[PDB]
Structure formats: C-alpha cells, structure tokens
Design a binder for this molecule. Sequence first.
Ligand SMILES: *[C@@H]1O[C@H](CO)[C@@H](O[C@@H]2O[C@H](CO)[C@@H](O[C@@H]3O[C@H](CO)[C@@H](O)[C@H](O)[C@@H]3O)[C@H](O)[C@H]2NC(C)=O)[C@H](O)[C@H]1NC(C)=O
Ligand SMILES: *[C@@H]1O[C@H](CO)[C@@H](O[C@@H]2O[C@H](CO)[C@@H](O[C@@H]3O[C@H](CO)[C@@H](O)[C@H](O)[C@@H]3O)[C@H](O)[C@H]2NC(C)=O)[C@H](O)[C@H]1NC(C)=O
Ligand SMILES: *[C@@H]1O[C@H](CO)[C@@H](O[C@@H]2O[C@H](CO)[C@@H](O[C@@H]3O[C@H](CO)[C@@H](O)[C@H](O)[C@@H]3O)[C@H](O)[C@H]2NC(C)=O)[C@H](O)[C@H]1NC(C)=O
Ligand SMILES: *[C@@H]1O[C@H](CO)[C@@H](O[C@@H]2O[C@H](CO)[C@@H](O[C@@H]3O[C@H](CO)[C@@H](O)[C@H](O)[C@@H]3O)[C@H](O)[C@H]2NC(C)=O)[C@H](O)[C@H]1NC(C)=O
Ligand SMILES: *[C@@H]1O[C@H](CO)[C@@H](O[C@@H]2O[C@H](CO)[C@@H](O[C@@H]3O[C@H](CO)[C@@H](O)[C@H](O)[C@@H]3O)[C@H](O)[C@H]2NC(C)=O)[C@H](O)[C@H]1NC(C)=O
Lengths: 346, 346, 346, 346, 346
Amino acid sequence: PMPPSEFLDKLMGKVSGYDARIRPNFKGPPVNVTCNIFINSFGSIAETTMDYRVNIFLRQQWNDPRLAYSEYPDDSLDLDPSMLDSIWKPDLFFANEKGANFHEVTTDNKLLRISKNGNVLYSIRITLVLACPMDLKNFPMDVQTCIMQLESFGYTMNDLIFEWDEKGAVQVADGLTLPQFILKEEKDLRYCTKHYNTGKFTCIEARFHLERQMGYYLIQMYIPSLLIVILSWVSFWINMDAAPARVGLGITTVLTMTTQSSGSRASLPKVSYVKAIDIWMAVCLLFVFSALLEYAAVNFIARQHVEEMRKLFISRAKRIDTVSRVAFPLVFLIFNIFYWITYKII
Amino acid sequence: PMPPSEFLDKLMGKVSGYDARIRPNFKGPPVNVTCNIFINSFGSIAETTMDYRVNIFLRQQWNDPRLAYSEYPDDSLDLDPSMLDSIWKPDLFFANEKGANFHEVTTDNKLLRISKNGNVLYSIRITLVLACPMDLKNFPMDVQTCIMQLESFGYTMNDLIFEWDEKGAVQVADGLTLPQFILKEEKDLRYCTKHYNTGKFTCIEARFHLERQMGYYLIQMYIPSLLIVILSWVSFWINMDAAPARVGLGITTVLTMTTQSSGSRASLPKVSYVKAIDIWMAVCLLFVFSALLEYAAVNFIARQHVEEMRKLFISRAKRIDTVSRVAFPLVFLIFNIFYWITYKII
Amino acid sequence: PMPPSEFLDKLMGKVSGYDARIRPNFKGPPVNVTCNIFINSFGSIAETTMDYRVNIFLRQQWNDPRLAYSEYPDDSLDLDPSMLDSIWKPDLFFANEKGANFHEVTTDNKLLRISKNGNVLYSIRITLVLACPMDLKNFPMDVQTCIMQLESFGYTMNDLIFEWDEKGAVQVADGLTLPQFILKEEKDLRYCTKHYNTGKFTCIEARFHLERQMGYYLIQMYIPSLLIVILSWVSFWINMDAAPARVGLGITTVLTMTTQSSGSRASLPKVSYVKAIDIWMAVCLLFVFSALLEYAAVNFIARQHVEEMRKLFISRAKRIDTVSRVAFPLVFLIFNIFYWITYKII
Amino acid sequence: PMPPSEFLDKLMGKVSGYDARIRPNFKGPPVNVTCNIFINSFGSIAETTMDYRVNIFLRQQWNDPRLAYSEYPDDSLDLDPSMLDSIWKPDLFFANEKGANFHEVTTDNKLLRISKNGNVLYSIRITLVLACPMDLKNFPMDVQTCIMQLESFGYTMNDLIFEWDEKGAVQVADGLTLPQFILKEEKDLRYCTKHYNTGKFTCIEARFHLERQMGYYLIQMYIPSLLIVILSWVSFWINMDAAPARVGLGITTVLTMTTQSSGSRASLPKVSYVKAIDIWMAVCLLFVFSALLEYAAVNFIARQHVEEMRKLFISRAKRIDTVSRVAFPLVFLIFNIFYWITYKII
Amino acid sequence: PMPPSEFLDKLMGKVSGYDARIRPNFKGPPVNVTCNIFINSFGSIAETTMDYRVNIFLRQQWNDPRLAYSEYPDDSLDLDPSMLDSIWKPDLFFANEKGANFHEVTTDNKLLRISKNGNVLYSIRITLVLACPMDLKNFPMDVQTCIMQLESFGYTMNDLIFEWDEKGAVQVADGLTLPQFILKEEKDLRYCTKHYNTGKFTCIEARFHLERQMGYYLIQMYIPSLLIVILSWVSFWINMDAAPARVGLGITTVLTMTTQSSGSRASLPKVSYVKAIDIWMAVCLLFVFSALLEYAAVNFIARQHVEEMRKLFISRAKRIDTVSRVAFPLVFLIFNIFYWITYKII
Ligand SMILES: *[C@@H]1O[C@H](CO)[C@@H](O[C@@H]2O[C@H](CO)[C@@H](O[C@@H]3O[C@H](CO)[C@@H](O)[C@H](O)[C@@H]3O)[C@H](O)[C@H]2NC(C)=O)[C@H](O)[C@H]1NC(C)=O
Ligand SMILES: *[C@@H]1O[C@H](CO)[C@@H](O[C@@H]2O[C@H](CO)[C@@H](O[C@@H]3O[C@H](CO)[C@@H](O)[C@H](O)[C@@H]3O)[C@H](O)[C@H]2NC(C)=O)[C@H](O)[C@H]1NC(C)=O
Ligand SMILES: *[C@@H]1O[C@H](CO)[C@@H](O[C@@H]2O[C@H](CO)[C@@H](O[C@@H]3O[C@H](CO)[C@@H](O)[C@H](O)[C@@H]3O)[C@H](O)[C@H]2NC(C)=O)[C@H](O)[C@H]1NC(C)=O
Ligand SMILES: *[C@@H]1O[C@H](CO)[C@@H](O[C@@H]2O[C@H](CO)[C@@H](O[C@@H]3O[C@H](CO)[C@@H](O)[C@H](O)[C@@H]3O)[C@H](O)[C@H]2NC(C)=O)[C@H](O)[C@H]1NC(C)=O
Ligand SMILES: *[C@@H]1O[C@H](CO)[C@@H](O[C@@H]2O[C@H](CO)[C@@H](O[C@@H]3O[C@H](CO)[C@@H](O)[C@H](O)[C@@H]3O)[C@H](O)[C@H]2NC(C)=O)[C@H](O)[C@H]1NC(C)=O
C-alpha cells in the first residue's frame, strides 16, 4: 500500500532507530561480506609507471538484521542511491589504489537492493589505477601478474571479514580485449590478511595473469634487428679487393644498431637488471661490430704486402672468405635457435 | 496568478507528496524513456588511447503522472535547474564513459520543462571521453565505428526501459567537422540489452561511422616512401663503371626508410597484427635493399675479372642494366596498382 | 540606519517574497541582458587541439524590478558573493566551452552591485578553453578568426535575450600581448541565434581576429630551407671533373631536407589539405633532388667516353655548366618572388 | 572562565549581531589591509608557458572594531579555521593567477588570531601558478622580472585598500634555492591601482628579480658550439693536397650545427624576435659553412690546372693556407670577445 | 547496553559540551601528539621536478580528557569516520606538500579508536607528492636524502607539540621496493622547529636515505660510452697507409658521442654545476677527438714527402704507431681506475 520509500522512512529512519554508524551483529561475530567484480574496461598498462586502469562493478553482499522487512510481499526492494548514504556500508578500500574515483554522470552509478532477510546487494562503478610491479627479466615474452586486493581500513578482523563468493567471483565483459595482452581465463583468488601495530584487517585479492602479444615487438624491434645482420653479411659478399665499399657497409649498419638500441628502451622503466630485449640487441651489436672488426683484419693483412708477399696475403684473404661466408650464418642461427627455446619454455 | 515556482512548491513539495525517490508508474509497467542527442563537439580521437571526446546535449523524455498540472493555462512550465534535484530523474549512465563531466560555467547547463500531461523534457550538456576499440587492419584507409551506449545502472528492465525517438534521434551541429575524419550521415540505432548476475538492464546505442581523410597520410608518409624509390632507381642510372657513387646512393636511401619506418608508427598503439601502412613501408624496404643488393652482384662480377674475362663480365653488366632499368619500375608499379585496388574496394 | 545586508535580508528574503527561481518580468517581455567582457589573459593557442585559453571578466546587466530599493539614499549597494546565490542570475553558458572554471582563491572572484531602479551588475572571473577550428591553407601567413559565443541554455528566446552594450563591449588589458599573434583591435559583434527541436535560444558572439608573428617561422624553418639551397648550388661550383665531392654535397643536403620536413609539421594537426609551409619545403626538395639528379647526367655522359669522344662529352659538361650556374638561381628566385606575393596579398 | 570558542559564540554569533556580510568601518574610511608573504616553494619556471609556481603563506591584517573583546585577559585568541568562514574576510585575489588552490591535507592550512583591539591576523597557504611574460632578447643571460599582484575584486578603492607592511613585507625560506635562477634579495614593492568601467580597485605587487645560472647552458650548448669550430679548423690542417678528407670533415661538422640549432630552441616559446643563443649558433653556422665554402675555392683553383699552370695554382693554395690557418682563429676570437662583452654589461 | 554511537551522542554531543573547536588541556601544557607513518607506495622520484610520491598511513595519538569514557567495559571504541569531523583533530600539515590528497574510494580511508583514558588513535591514508631538492654532483652514484616534515600550521609551540613514538616510528611495507633506488633501513628522526614573525611551531621530520641502482645507467650510458672508445682504437689498427678508412672510422665515432651526450642529460634538470655522468662522457669526447686529431698528424706528415723524404716520414708513422697502439689503452684505463675509485669511496 504505502510507498516503499515512505516505508523505508520507517525502515531505517529515526523510528526503529537504524543508526548507520553501528555495524550489523554488533558485539557478535564479524560481518561476513561476500564480494565479486565485473570488468568493463581494462588496459592502459603503463610500464613507465607500472600500474593499470580498470573499470569494475564492485558488488558487495552482507546481512543486516536491522534491514529485515516483513510486511512487504516481495523479495527485493531496490532504492535509488539518494538514500544510499542512509544505511551502513563497509569501508572496503583498495590496498593499491594509486588513484580511483566514482562515476557521477547523470546519477551516482550505484545499485542498492535489499532482500527480505536483510541481504544487502551493493554495487558501484569504480575506475581504479592499480599499482602492480612489473617483472621484466624476459621482457617481450613476460607473463605479468598484476593484482588488486580489497582490504578493510577501519574495522579489525574480529569485526569485519571479506570473502569471495563461489558462483563466479570475477566476471569479465563479453568482448573485453586488450591492445597488447591476453587476460588469461584462470584467475586466482586468495587471502592477503594483513597485520599492523593497530591490529589485523581483512583482505582478499584476485591475481590477473597477463601474457603479451608478441606480434608488435616482433615487427618494430626484431626485424630491424634482423635486417642489419643480413645487411652486415652481404657486406662481406662485397668485391674481393678491399675497397671503400666495406668502409661504408660496416659503419653504416653499426650506427643503425646504436640508434636501434636507443629507441629499444624508449617506453621502458629504468630497471637495473638486464632484460631479454636488450641481450638480443646486444648480440646484434657484437656481430655488426664483427664486420668492421673483420675488415680490420683484411685491411691489416692487405697492407702487409712480391712473390712470397702476395702468395701469403691472398692465402689469408681466402681462408677469411670461406669462413665468414658461413661463420656469421653459423653462429647467428645457432644463437637464434638457442635464444627462442630459452623463452619458448616459460 | 500565483508564481509557478510557488505553484511548484505544491506541485512536488511535501504537499501532494511528490517523493523523488520513487519512479513513476510504480508497480506498473516500466518507465518508457525516449532519448536523443545533439553533438556540439566531436574529435580528439586518440588512437594511442582508442577513445574520443564528444560534447552532447542529452535530451530525455518520460511521463510522470505525479507531475500533471491542470490549473495552469499553458503547455510548458520550464524551471531553472536549482530545483532539478527535486524531481525524479532516470539514472542513465554511459556504459563506456572512461571519464565524463557536467558543465557548470555560470550555471549548471541544464534544461527542464514539463508538459500538462506530465511529459518531462530533461536536457543536460555533457562532455564524454568514450572508449571505442580501433580496428587497424587497413590503417590509413580504415572505417572506424566508434559507439556510445546508454544503459541504466540501478533499475532493471522490468522497471525502466530506454528508447530512441523516431523524429531524428541524433542531430549534429550545422558546421561540425573533424580534422581527420568524415562523420558519415548514416547513424545506426540498435539495442544492446544487457544481462548480469543481478538482472537485465536497458540499453540503446548509436554507432557513428568514421572514415579517414587520407590526404594527410598521403603526404607525410607515402610521398617520402615514394621519393626514396625513385631516388633508388636513378642510383642505377649511375655511371656504367662501378664507383663509390653507388656506394653512397645505396646505403643513404636505405637509412632513410629505416628512419621513415621509425616515425611510421609514431602515434600508433602497439597492435600485434600487421596493419596496411607498414606493409607499404615494408615493400619500400625490400626494394631499396635491392639496390644495395644489386650492386653486390655488380661489384661481385666486376672483381671476377683479359679477353675472355672482360668479354663475359661486361656481358653481365649489360643484361643487368637493361633489366634493372625497367624491372624496378615494372614490379614497383604493378605492386602499386595491386595495393591501392586492395584498399579501394573496402 | 539599519545595516544594508540586514536591509537585504528583507530586500530578497522570505519577507517580500523574492523567489530566486523566477525570472524578472515574468509572463512579460523577455529579460534584456547586456553583456561585455574584459580580457586579462589570452594565449596558449594550441593548434594540436585547435583551442585557446582566455581569462575574462564577464560583466552582465539586467533589470529586476523586485530588486528596486527606495528608502536608501545612494545609487549602488554592493554585496559580497556570499549571498550571490540568493538573487536570480541568467544561465549564460559558452557554446564552445571545452572546459572552463571559476576562480576561488581567497574568495569567489565575483562582483555584485545593484542600482536603485533594479539594475544588476554581475561580474565574475572566468578561465575558458575555447574551441576555434583553425584554417591552415596558408599556414605561416594565416589570419585565424577564433570566436567565443554566449548562449542561454534553459530559457528560450521569448523569455531571455542577450545583447552587447554599445559603450565598449570588449575591453582588453593595457599591455596584453601574445607570443605568436597580434590581437587586432577590430573586434566583430554579431548574433548567432540558435534553433533546436526544443526552441530558439539567445546568442551573441565576438570574433577575435588573429594574425601571426611570422618572425619565428622565418628563422627556424625558412632560413634552414634556404641554406640547403645555396649549399646545393655551390655543390655545382665544385671542381670541373666529376669526383666523389659531388657524391657528398648532393645526398648530404637532400637528407637535411628530409629531416627538415619531418620537424616541419611537428606541432601541426593532421590536416588532409596542403598548407603553405610544406609546398615551400616541397619545392626546396625538388631543387636539392635536382642536384643529385644533375650529377646523374654529368656522371652518365662522362662514362660514355678518343678525339670525337672527349670532344663531345666535355661539350656537354660545358653547356651543363653555364646553365646550372644560373638556372638554379634563376628559377629559385623567380619562385621566391612568386611565393611571397601570393601570400603578401592576403 | 567560559571556553573562548563558547566566548566567540557570543563574540560574533547572532548575539551582538556580527554580520559577516558587512565590512568593518561601514560607511566610513576604507578598510586598510596590510599584507606580507612567505615563500616556501618557488620554481618550475616554464618558459614554454611563461609562468611559474609558488607556495606562499599570505598573511593579512585588518582592524575590525566588531571583534574587540574586552573581558578576556590576554592579547591573542587564536581559533581553528572551522569558524574561519564566520568572520569577515577581504576578497584578495591574484590578478595573474592562471591557476591556484588551497591546501587541505589533514586540515585547511589556515591561521586566525585576533588581538584585543580587533586586529585580525589571517594567514593561509596558497599554491599559485603565476603568469609572467618572459623577455628573451638576451636569452641565456637574461634577467627575468616576474611579478605577483594582489587586487581586490569586489570592493572599490573607496571601501577597501591594500598595503604592504614595512617590517619585512616579503620573507623567503631559509634555504630556498632554484635549479636555474638566483632569487635576488632586492624585492620591489609598488602599487598597481587599477581602473575599469566599474570603478577603481586596490592593488599591490612585489617584483621578483631573477637571474639565470649560466652554468648549464654553458655546457649543453656553447661547448658543442665550440668543438665544431675547432673541429672545423683542423679540417684545414688536413693534408696539403685536396683529398676526400676535407670532403668528410666539412659536411660532417655542418650537419652537427644543423642538428645543434634544432635542439637549440627545444624548450623555447615561438618568439618572433631574435634572441641571443641563436645568433651565437648562427655565427657558428657561417664559420662551419666557410669550411665547405673554402674547399670549394681550393678544389676550384686546383682543377684549373704545366709550368705556368702549377706555378700559379699552388701559389693560390699557399696564400689560402697562411690566411685560413690564422683567419678563422682571428675572426672567431674577436667575435667571442665582442659577444661576451655585449652581455657582460647588462 | 545502549549502542555506543548512541553512547557517543552524549560522549561528545551537546550534552557534556564537547566543543570540537577547543584543544584538549586548554590553557595548560601543550598537546603532546606522538606520530608514526606506514609506507605503502613509494617511487616516481622525478628529478625533472625534484619531488616524489608516497602513500602513507599517518597515525596520530594525543590524549583528550574530555573523551574519557568510564561506564564502558572495554579498552577501545572504534567509530566510523562519519563522525570523525566531530572530535578535535590536530592540524598537522606537510611543510613540503607540493600536492596531496585523501583517498575516498567506497569510504573515507580513515581510522578512529579511543581508549578509556582518552587516548585518540587517528590514522588516515594520504598520497603526498613531496619536494626534495636533489644533489647531483656525482649523479649515477649519488645518495639522495629526501625528507618529509610534519608541522603544525595554526597552533604555536606553546599549545601543540609533535613527537615521534619510540616503538618503530616509521614502518615500511613488507615487499616495498623501487625501480631505481634502495630505501636504506636507517631512517633519521630529528626536529625541525620553525620560527616566523607569527611565532614558533612544532615540527618533526624523517630523513629517507636513497641510493641508486647503478645497473641501468651502467648499461644505457657507460657501455655505449665504452664501445665508441674501443671502436676508436681499432680505427688506429687500420692499414698502415693513410686511406679514407680512417676518414670514416674517425668522424663516425665522434658523431656517436655527440648524440650520446645529447641523450645523456635527457631526463635531467638544468643544473648549472657539473655532475659526474657528463665528465665521463666528456673524457670520452676528447679521446674520440684524439683519433681524428691523430690522423691529422699522420695525414700531415705523410703529405710532407725521395730517399731522405720517405726515410723520415715513415720514421714518424712508426713512432706514432707503437705509441697510439698502447697510449690510448694506457691513459684510458688509468682514467677508468681513477674515476671509479673517486666514486667508490662515497
Ligand atoms: C561469519 O562466518 C564465520 C565463519 O564460519 C562464522 O564463524 C563461525 O561461526 C559458527 C557459528 O556459530 C561457529 O560454530 C560454532 O563453533 C564453536 C567453536 O568452534 C563450536 O563449538 C560450535 O559447536 C559451533 O560449531 C564457528 O566456530 C565460527 N568460526 C569462526 C572461525 O569464527 C561467523 O559466525 C559468521 N558471522 C556472521 C555474522 O555471519
Ligand atoms: C512502455 O511501453 C511498453 C511497450 O509497448 C508497454 O508495454 C505494453 O503495454 C501495452 C499496454 O497495456 C500492452 O498491451 C496489452 O498486452 C496484453 C498482452 O500482450 C494484451 O492482451 C492486451 O490486449 C494489450 O494489448 C502490451 O502487452 C505491453 N507489452 C510489453 C512488451 O510490455 C508499457 O505498458 C509501457 N509503459 C508505460 C509506463 O508507458
Ligand atoms: C527588451 O527589448 C525588446 C526590444 O525592444 C523589447 O521589445 C519591444 O518592446 C517595445 C516596448 O513595448 C515594443 O514597442 C511596442 O511595439 C508594438 C508592436 O510593435 C507597437 O504597436 C507599440 O506602439 C510599441 O511601439 C516593441 O514592439 C517590442 N519589440 C520586440 C521585437 O519585442 C522588450 O519589451 C524589452 N523587454 C524588457 C523586459 O525590457
Ligand atoms: C586608512 O588609511 C588612510 C590613509 O591615511 C586613512 O585616510 C586618512 O585618514 C586620516 C584620518 O582622519 C585623514 O586625516 C584628516 O584629513 C583631513 C583632510 O585631509 C584633515 O583636514 C584632517 O585634519 C585630518 O588630518 C586623512 O585625510 C585621510 N587621507 C586619505 C587619503 O584618506 C583612512 O582613514 C584609514 N582608514 C581606516 C579605517 O583605518
Ligand atoms: C607534554 O610533554 C612535555 C614534556 O615533558 C610536558 O612538559 C613538562 O611537564 C612536566 C610535568 O609537569 C614538568 O615537570 C615539572 O617541571 C617543573 C619545572 O621544570 C619542575 O619544577 C617540577 O618539579 C616538575 O618536574 C616539566 O617542567 C615540563 N617541561 C616542559 C619543557 O614543558 C608537558 O606537561 C606535557 N603536556 C601534556 C598535556 O601532556
């Protein structure tokens, strides 16, 4: 009969004394809050900052006996967020926020329904910029594991406990994809119960596995790394006589790799350890330096020399020919097969 | 007689009991809300982020019987937004906001008029930064289809339904243009009714087709890609004798394309698949590498050699001349005609 | 006697019934609002965004008969903005805001005085970031005309009309200058009365003419464009015999222009049409390519050749000398005189 | 006895009628407000924007007879900013704000004490981003004079007047330094009384003198400008015979200066006039172009030529030797001594 | 019995007269406030700005006799931050904020418990962007000491005093690390009691020592600095006869160092003094300039010359050979051993 908001005026109003400043089950067991998330947006995973932005629908559920309506004939009584500041709400924060905000476009993006037995479904749209430290040992073939963990800031573990629900604690949007990663379907769910000099607080955290789309880096970095090598090999297929041709083909290619390695770590943090993309472009350096270093041997032995003179110099230009025409493709290919098996096993 | 705002004090005030926290037609059919938009601003379509900013006038219309004034002699009773927080308003949010805000310069940019029969026109200026994933298979000749979709966050499909109005659901400003695209006049309008573990919610979405102005990329990228080829052809129109001239004209041009392809994907996301602008600048690579690779053949056969010697070496420098003087323009032009027909058919 | 704020407690308070939610002259003629602006800041005209930031003092004046004090012995009764939310205020917004904000440092930067006959002077400091589409046909010699237009968002043309005042509708700060433009003193003032599917609304807009300081671009772009040409001419003043000197002076200069044109459109939007700065740096390309193309002719005819042989080859190296020693300065200067007259007439 | 805040409940409360909306000395002389500042932070002087950020403690002092407590036995009655919105406060704004904000971390950073005779000390932490137009005639040796000026926005000069106090109107933090400038101890204090079509308003402004640390620019710009010159001089100490060595040493150095001047005005606004750093790097251009221009003379006269032939050509290669071996160090050093005295006198 | 929030309605409410605007121990000794922090986030130490962002849990403790509950049977009475604006709170600000904000995601991240004897534990999550001037004498091997200092803004030293607690005044997160530094465990704690023309205020500050991960700079900067040297040494292992080979290997390497030093101070403020990374890359300059300077000697003495002629020129090419083949590795290695011991002792 009476309008339910008018019903809720006495549901939680000064009549019946719903004090929003006192958790349910006061002085009893803690408040068991089941949580799950829904991921609209995901991406902008900046490694310069080692964070990422997500746009989730945080759903919470707890049981408040003070909210147990009985007269009403249905199961759910939704209510606009205008009085969402009227009921008790758990102080779930994100232990690695690094910035977050509500969405208030045309309305507070909030949801509030209440079952007969006091079950409170509480859902709000959030945009987080979560911090996840990036492990970059094997950079272009890394599997980053960024996390988001939900703690309680004020209430201790003996008054408020979080939990994930079993029926799909983490849903993802239907066509949600990324420009650079693959959000692997397996998603871990484990506790991260904290301790301070103030007490112990509740935590739960879902670990998102991330694997890179190697297609991009395969193009901008590896192929340019690979052309300079083959360009540095036919430089040895140059004319037999040492002329300024090898003078050009040598230093030109080395200068490429010098600039390549510059833009190599362009959008990369200043990590002290050595990653995998650079040792590729390191080995690519010492081969292209082998070219200018090899002609040093040729131009050295050539200026040495004349029967016995030319008979021994060209004998050096020949053994140096039949070796470099296969040695560079020999070690460079054996290096490649070893490099990629090292990273195809992780 | 009485001032209508003073009339509205009893229109929605505590007299007559207009509770703003209870939707119209409560416990009856859902609230049928017709929507349309008006686009002032449009642009800043960043592909680094794959989003875009728009400045719209969202108009809504629903019928609230509680707002049915009868005494008054006219059709419309506008009212400043100061009491726009006084009436019920649907919680239309944008399912792909990624940031949005109201405009509050000198007044809340809001509009509110009410017909005799309870029709509520509600219009507000909004600045959205909407997320649209970019498909970049054929990059400079792509037709991106960015969308904006209007969902309800709290009310389920059985209590609130959105709809587009038939009489021009999407107007565009008179001289609205873009720096890079053409907002095609055809604009699609279809439902995107959602489902969650909470229920099903209303959605409507308008698909904006976008086609690129190819004029820019035709200049900064293609012509510089095209000069290096012709510069790499008259390099073969060099003197007959193999001199360091071809030493210069070869590696110089190849270094251009190396730097060209660097700035090629300058403002482009790190997409794993291969787009169309790069295979252009890829084929431009393997021709300019053909130049330095061709002189490798010339300088190789030249150092081989003398009656029978010169009689067979210059016979190779001639067949290599009459072929390269037409072969590069042969395959390069046939490539061009094939490339552009592949992209003039989409 | 009584304090005038205490006087204004009954001026607009619940006594005498000043309802701030009802415009003056209700049900009568529209409210004639005269406006003018004062420009403190102006600049940051970003062409990457095609907008600009301004810091104005928007003065408004309308007549409200409800504000007609009679007892008081003076003309003006100022009042701090603390009760500036107490009176009626027109909802003037900026039709091309693209971001704007009030200034609230140590006080709301607001002004409010009221004449005896109800005249309301209302002035507030605003920082706008206004959108003006840039026309870049003739880029370094363009005259951009950015605008700012003042519309009413809620009230229709039959209830509220804006106007500029005749006595200097737009003042500019005394020493206000720009880093790149000259704010021409002539400032246009014309209506932009709008129409929608909701009605017709009031508008007024002041067109600011802007002309560029060509001094900067004359230095960073044109001179470097001009040195490469003269460097590409004395390259032909090289030794008579074709040596690797022309091998160097040719490709070196062309590589400059390639990088010049890269940084040419560095801070420029991706406009499809062709502007004027590039056709300059385009013509500068085809002359420097003429150098490497000319030596192609020299090195070609030289390798052709010997009495009749040298007697006809050097006859070609001579006619090619007396022509290129004046032809490049011939066409290049005639091009310059034509280019600058094309742009000195607009 | 009674708690002084409870004392201030009747100090300014509805008892005794302290109306915060009415300035002291109403209808009498204007309110004489003495001001001074204290500078915590200072820096981020961006010339791309021509502004700078400061973090000051604005102290104000005015006398309000309505605040004259008599019963109390002490001189000062501080009070937390919670009731700082309760008293009258002057509307001091900053005429060149360009952005400013309060600091609200753990409390509004505000101070409020009141002497017996009504003296109000009012102090608040502010972070300003003030606009100062930069004069860049002599760029690396410029003395910028940025200002900050304190106006009143609402009250006219006949109702409110600002003043600096004599006892150290501008204090600076003890170890406050800058990365690029030296905040000279002399700080000017003069009025900037304004006039509009609304009246005349109070102003005071303190002029901060700033002088650059020339040490940085002496390293990144001048030394690289200076190495290319000496590298372009020993290029003339090359072998007597004109070989491709001068072919290399000439164009290589000129290309450096071309890229040097690119990054010269890297972080510099697009000012039309010519500054001092560029004419340095301009004169450095025309000397390095003299090198490639000089070898043009050598390679020209060399190809001219043979008894009388070589007897006159080498006579030109000798007079060109004994001159260039001292002429470049002659004019270049005389240029340096003239350049630096032009800028050591300002 | 009664709900404690309802108990706190009379704990601090208008009954019993808890005036939040009056510090504890009024007119007595100052309020002794013990503080400690807990560091979640730490990093983004930008030297371009010379600041850094931290995410701390500021815990405060003071004793307020007015908050002494006696009836209740326990030690602690937590309470949600909804009434955290109800009690007195010290106005601790950060003397070098440069920007800071609260975290309000799903609740104000705040904590409030009260012991029986009035002890108030008050803890709030804060994100600071603190200013620390960077000392960059020895840049890649520097030990920066950034600070954060906690002052009181309003209350003087005779009414409010801060202190650190002895039991671990500064805790750090368990796995908190940085991308570039090592937060040394030793953390200093000393007073910074201030003085102004208003009085003396309380301060405490914790000095965080920071030492760099030299691993990154060891790779991007030093190795490229080191390859050019060895590339500039085997350039002297070139053929005995002076050919254009040394023409290439000389200027090519010098151009590398020119571009190296460009990107050397890429992300570095414009400090006037000379740091350590540049004198490394300065000494690397004058060795690679020694190469092109050395061949100047070779090509000079070579063109001088013929029995006595060649007998004295090659005698110079030999003593120049046996010296440069060890002199560059001689001085360069002795330089290295001296450089690194200068920086391994600090
Ligand atoms: C929130 O969930 C926790 C997790 O179960 C609940 O704690 C558990 O509550 C049950 C119900 O009383 C306890 O069962 C009893 O345990 C005692 C001692 O173990 C046993 O002797 C009894 O026969 C009975 O089985 C259980 O011990 C207790 N466990 C823990 C770890 O707390 C809690 O009650 C829930 N609170 C709410 C408000 O839902
Ligand atoms: C909002 O619009 C929807 C769409 O039409 C309305 O739902 C429709 O309402 C009509 C009016 O009663 C229903 O017509 C009746 O349907 C029954 C069963 O189909 C039929 O036996 C009756 O003879 C009569 O035609 C219609 O069924 C119903 N359809 C749906 C899908 O809901 C709704 O009433 C509107 N609500 C408001 C508040 O305007
Ligand atoms: C705001 O300014 C407009 C512009 O003038 C005012 O509208 C004009 O008001 C005058 C005053 O009554 C009207 O004059 C009368 O016009 C009728 C019909 O044209 C004529 O027969 C009468 O003899 C008399 O001249 C005028 O028509 C009217 N014009 C328009 C276009 O509205 C308006 O009254 C002003 N409102 C306020 C509140 O100041
Ligand atoms: C704020 O400071 C100004 C600056 O002094 C005060 O104005 C001055 O007030 C004195 C005090 O009455 C005036 O002195 C009188 O001047 C008249 C005419 O000059 C003279 O005949 C009298 O013998 C007496 O000396 C002075 O003229 C006046 N000057 C100005 C420029 O206003 C003002 O009173 C101060 N207001 C407050 C609230 O402190
Ligand atoms: C906050 O902590 C300070 C630091 O101790 C307290 O100040 C100290 O308070 C004690 C307690 O009365 C004073 O002791 C007395 O000192 C006098 C003179 O020195 C001596 O003759 C007495 O026999 C007795 O020892 C002590 O002097 C005083 N020192 C200072 C520097 O203030 C303060 O009382 C504490 N306040 C609160 C509210 O906890």
